[PDB]
Structure formats: structure tokens, C-alpha cells
Design a protein around this ligand. Structure first.
Ligand SMILES: *[C@@H]1O[C@H](CO)[C@@H](O[C@@H]2O[C@H](CO)[C@@H](O)[C@H](O)[C@H]2NC(C)=O)[C@H](O)[C@H]1NC(C)=O
Ligand SMILES: *[C@@H]1O[C@H](CO)[C@@H](O[C@@H]2O[C@H](CO)[C@@H](O)[C@H](O)[C@H]2NC(C)=O)[C@H](O)[C@H]1NC(C)=O
Ligand SMILES: *[C@@H]1O[C@H](CO)[C@@H](O[C@@H]2O[C@H](CO)[C@@H](O)[C@H](O)[C@H]2NC(C)=O)[C@H](O)[C@H]1NC(C)=O
Ligand SMILES: *[C@@H]1O[C@H](CO)[C@@H](O[C@@H]2O[C@H](CO)[C@@H](O)[C@H](O)[C@H]2NC(C)=O)[C@H](O)[C@H]1NC(C)=O
Ligand SMILES: *[C@@H]1O[C@H](CO)[C@@H](O[C@@H]2O[C@H](CO)[C@@H](O)[C@H](O)[C@H]2NC(C)=O)[C@H](O)[C@H]1NC(C)=O
Lengths: 105, 90, 50
């Protein structure tokens, strides 16, 4: 509605018989190739991502926001768990780090 | 019709050219979704895209994955119902 | 000549492959809209008879 891309801000300017608007928008660029997986299997449970998608760099797995690559370790507190491992087509076998356990030592 | 000083000018865009715009359009939104309408197209597997759109309404993503078969079936039988509504209803 | 509609590039769709942006550019587009005309007026009798 207000310029191509994701609208961020606008400023009006005058004109003799009209109004000219400047619409400042965000546009993504420089995108890479990643492998994905709808959900992960860990100890028999399906771990779905909360905010973002699980993405693989070939030999490692992470979780990131869909707007901009910012990889992070797939941990218990960024992924919710529901149902069983064998239920949704497309899971992959991986591990999940639990931040609590390093504290018990 | 047109026989004494009246005419009709042809359109600039022919039927095959419009059907080429609409083929490009709905061949994009399958492969890239809203993305291709902002910048470069980004290939995203379809089922993931639908799951996201579910999150976009307010239903937890897992609902789509668990029920993927029923969803696909309802979609298909709906397209066929439209095909027949149009094929018969004047 | 016959007009071209644009470039022809097909997307490498897969069922386990996603493309993700790693940078961004903010761009300031412009838009123009009229909102008025000259408030004209004509005296009908002077125009016709004067
Ligand atoms: C994702 O990976 C593919 C292949 O690994 C990249 O490939 C090319 O894209 C062009 C576009 O038309 C195709 O014709 C080629 O067949 C693709 N494969 C090649 C050249 O090996 C693609 O560019 C990557 N996309 C992103 C966003 O990283
Ligand atoms: C995928 O990502 C992982 C994690 O970044 C990469 O593993 C790292 O490789 C670098 C380069 O040797 C090492 O310095 C790091 O120690 C590694 N990470 C750790 C701490 O395990 C991996 O090389 C990447 N591979 C691909 C194909 O993208
Ligand atoms: C995604 O597509 C690929 C290729 O179409 C599918 O791979 C086929 O899967 C069957 C069942 O496991 C295998 O017998 C075939 O050999 C696979 N083909 C290839 C070329 O690898 C895959 O199953 C699809 N679904 C995913 C990955 O979830
Ligand atoms: C995920 O891990 C499970 C657990 O190892 C795999 O299931 C095993 O499959 C092997 C190969 O046939 C069997 O020998 C084991 O008996 C299975 N374990 C159990 C407890 O069922 C499963 O194949 C893995 N899947 C993927 C995609 O990596
Ligand atoms: C995103 O794109 C911009 C566009 O140039 C990149 O900007 C330049 O980065 C180089 C890195 O060596 C700098 O030397 C230049 O000064 C930057 N240009 C400007 C406008 O100052 C930027 O680096 C890209 N993002 C990333 C993460 O590399």
C-alpha cells in the first residue's frame, strides 16, 4: 500500500496541487542456501521452533528468524515440544542442549 | 455492430499475454509466498509456508503438520467442487 | 517488435531447501497524488449576453 517492500516510515512533502510522500522501506538482500526440517526428534519428542525455522548448514543445525540469518543453538527454551517423534513426515534426528543441566554440576 | 464510422480498437495486452502474467503470478506464490512480492524470490518448501500462514492466523504451527493429510484432501475436494459449480451453474 | 513481459527465471524449488537473506537495504521510494484543482467560476449572463 505504501511503497514496495516492508513499510518502515514515511514523510509528507508539499506540492502546488498535490502531496508527495516519501515512503522509506526495508528490503532484504544477499540470501544463501540452507537445508531445513519441519521439526526435530529428540529422545522421542518432537521439538518445533518457536520464532523461526530450524536450518541446517550441511553438518550442523540451528534455529533462526525468517527475516534475517542469525544462527543460534537449538535449545529447550527456544523450541516447544508436542506430540510424539513419529507423527509428522519430515523430522530429522538431532540433539537439543538443555541449559539447566550444566548448572547441576 | 460496426458499419458507419464506428469501430473498436484492439487491446494492447492479448489473451495469451495476460494468461502469462497470471501464470507467473500463481507460479510465484507457490514457490516463495509473500517474499517474492518484496524483493528476490526465496524458495521455501510449500508445507512449511502453509504452516507459517497458520501461525499467521493464530493456530500453533504443529496443527498443520499433524493434520497435513486432511488439509490436503479438503483443499483438493474444494477445488473440484469449484470446477463443477462453474462447469454447470449458469 | 513484440513487447517483452520481463525476464524469465525459474526458482529452484525443493522440498528440503530454503533461501535466507543475510543483508538488507533500506530504500526511500516516492509517491505523487493530486488533491485539488483551480476554483474556477463563470458568470452565465455575461458569458451569454454581456
Ligand atoms: C540454492 O542452491 C542452488 C543449487 O545448489 C543454487 O542454484 C542455481 O539457481 C539457478 C537459478 O535459475 C538454477 O538455474 C541452477 O540450477 C541452480 N543450481 C546451480 C547453479 O547449481 C541457488 O542459487 C541457491 N539459492 C540461494 C538463494 O542460495
Ligand atoms: C556448519 O556450522 C558449524 C558451526 O559453525 C561449523 O563448525 C565450525 O567450523 C569452524 C571452522 O573450522 C570451527 O572453527 C568451529 O569450531 C566449528 N564449530 C564448532 C564449535 O563445532 C561447520 O564447519 C559448518 N559447516 C558447513 C558446511 O557450513
Ligand atoms: C522430498 O523429495 C525427495 C525427492 O523427490 C524425496 O526423496 C524420495 O524419497 C523416497 C522415500 O524415502 C526415496 O525412496 C527416494 O529415493 C527419494 N528421492 C530422491 C531423489 O532422493 C523425499 O522423500 C521428499 N520428502 C522429504 C525429503 O521429506
Ligand atoms: C532416528 O533414530 C532412531 C533411533 O536410533 C532410528 O531408529 C533406529 O533405526 C535403526 C536402523 O534400522 C534400528 O536398528 C534401531 O532399532 C532403531 N531404533 C529404534 C529405537 O527404533 C531412526 O531410524 C532414526 N531416524 C533418522 C531419520 O535418523
Ligand atoms: C551488507 O551490504 C552492505 C553494502 O555495501 C555492506 O557494506 C560494506 O561492508 C564493507 C565490509 O568490508 C565495508 O568495507 C563498507 O564500508 C560497507 N559499505 C558501507 C555502505 O559502508 C555490508 O558489509 C553488508 N553486510 C555484511 C554483514 O557484510
Amino acid at each position: 500500500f505504501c511503497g514496495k517492500g516492508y513499510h518502515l516510515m514515511s514523510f509528507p512533502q508539499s506540492a502546488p496541487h498535490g502531496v508527495v510522500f516519501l515512503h522509506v522501506t526495508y528490503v532484504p538482500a544477499q540470501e544463501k542456501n540452507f537445508t531445513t526440517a519441519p521439526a526435530i526428534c529428540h529422545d522421542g519428542k518432537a521439538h518445533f521452533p518457536r520464532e523461526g525455522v530450524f536450518v541446517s548448514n550441511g553438518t550442523h543445525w540451528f534455529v533462526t528468524q525468517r527475516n534475517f540469518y542469525e544462527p543460534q543453538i537449538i535449545t529447550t527454551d527456544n523450541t516447544f515440544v508436542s506430540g510424539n517423534c513419529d507423527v509428522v513426515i519430515g523430522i530429522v534426528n538431532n540433539t537439543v542442549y538443555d541449559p539447566l543441566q550444566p548448572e547441576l554440576d | 455492430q460496426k458499419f458507419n464510422g464506428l469501430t473498436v480498437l484492439p487491446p494492447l495486452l492479448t489473451d495469451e499475454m495476460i494468461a502469462q502474467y497470471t501464470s507467473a503470478l500463481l507460479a510465484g506464490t507457490i514457490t516463495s509466498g509473500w517474499t517474492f512480492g518484496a524483493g528476490a524470490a526465496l524458495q521455501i518448501p510449500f508445507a512449511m509456508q502453509m504452516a507459517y500462514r497458520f501461525n499467521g492466523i493464530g493456530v500453533t504451527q504443529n496443527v498443520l503438520y499433524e493434520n497435513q493429510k486432511l488439509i490436503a484432501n479438503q483443499f483438493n475436494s474444494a477445488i473440484g467442487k469449484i470446477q463443477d459449480s462453474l462447469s454447470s451453474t449458469a | 517488435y513484440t513487447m517483452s513481459l520481463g525476464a524469465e527465471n525459474s526458482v529452484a524449488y525443493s522440498n528440503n531447501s530454503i533461501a535466507i537473506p543475510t543483508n538488507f537495504t533500506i530504500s526511500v521510494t516516492t509517491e505523487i497524488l493530486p488533491v485539488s484543482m483551480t476554483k474556477t467560476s463563470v458568470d452565465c449572463t455575461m458569458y451569454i449576453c454581456g
